[PDB]
């Protein structure tokens with residue numbers, strides 16, 4: 141009972157078995173320079189970034205091309221805008237980029253050491269600068285005659301008022317890259333997911349690392365280097381993710397939630413092409429659906445990032461795949477795909493036939509499952525009350541297992557809590573003291589589905 145149909149897959153064709161010569165093991169990073177501002181709005185640009193064959197794309201001097209004022213994201217500006225704003229700090233050890241060692245520099249290791257704490261934007265800026273001076277002094281002293289670093293991460297720029305001029309600047313981007321867009325699935329969630337449909341600011345010093353990961357539910361990522369400093373990026377095509385996952389298992393680090401920094405020789409040995417590139421100030425990085433990446437600052441710089449859900453067959457498929465996989469692994473999907481799929485079918489025209497078929501198949505599965513559930517409740521003499529969804533009402537998750545609960549809600553009173561059926565039953569043998577709710581009647585879903593047609 142997958143929400144996906146295998147025959148519908150648009151995933152590109154790659155063979156692990158076929159041998160790869162060294163050069164194929166280091167691919168050139170897809171790179172774009174915009175001659176004219178109107179280029180950034182070319183449908184050619186969109187088709188290039190979202191292409192399945194392009195796991196990652198750098199847009200060179202994007203900020204210049206559109207006259208983005210990155211100064212608005214400079215550390216001084218941020219201190220002025222929000223000094224006491226809190227920031228999540230990661231205490232790491234500074235190392236070369238293509239290397240992560242044990243304590244003695246005997247051996248390369250996958251597990252990545254990162255330690256959490258919290259400070260204020262103001263205090264972190266003081267460190268970032270003090271950090272800079274000291275490196276400068278040591279540089280001058282020489283001319284005249286384990287380094288521990290702190291990394292400022294996941295700083296939340298969600299509030300509009302404080303960050304108004306900052307966020308307004310990003311409206312200059314093409315629609316498919318914007319925080320909020322009718323063509324962006326994350327805009328159809330109906331609630332705010334920090335760091336995905338809101339902006340995240342990173343404040344870095346040389347050696348600052350973000351370890352290996354895929355984005356939540358395989359959503360695309362957009363990243364802009366404020367500068368001055370150059371960031372170094374590593375990426376691997378979605379196709380090889382499970383192989384990288386097996387490495388984490390064998391080294392006893394959780395792939396999804398663990399902190400790991402790949403051993404490059406391991407990948408090459410495994411016939412896995414790695415993308416290596418530098419991202420300079422004003423360069424924009426587009427991370428395509430489900431690309432495995434990890435990043436290091438080489439200089440002193442800030443970055444901004446957020447996620448975007450492109451309305452493409454490939455993004456949709458990969459989003460749904462990771463949605464099902466999370467459930468298998470008992471990991472909460474932060475993007476409620478079923479609720480999102482219905483929102484999209486209902487507020488957005490779909491012209492692409494491969495995408496349309498996928499959303500359609502998903503909706504159908506959702507109806508069948510709701511229909512199977514309604515009868516089993518009915519011939520158990522369980523009563524289902526009709527509740528009607530409130531305007532701007534957020535999806536629901538089971539208080540126990542974290543699974544998305546759609547259409548039919550099981551509710552209890554401690555006030556109120558929502559569960560899936562398994563967790564409600566587990567709690568009560570007969571569902572006694574459990575109120576079952578119906579968000580929409582078979583008819584609502586049946587009519588929305590039939591009205592959902594391919595657009596020219």
Ligand SMILES: O=C(O)CNC(=O)C(=O)O
Pocket residue numbers: 342349350355361362363427433435443445446
């Ligand atoms: O820039 C960083 O440190 C981490 N950023 C990302 O992984 C991203 O933009 O998807």
Ligand code: NI
Pocket residue numbers: 353354355361427433
């Ligand atoms: Ni990322």
Ligand SMILES: [Zn+2]
Pocket residue numbers: 538539540541542543559560561562563564
């Ligand atoms: Zn549950």
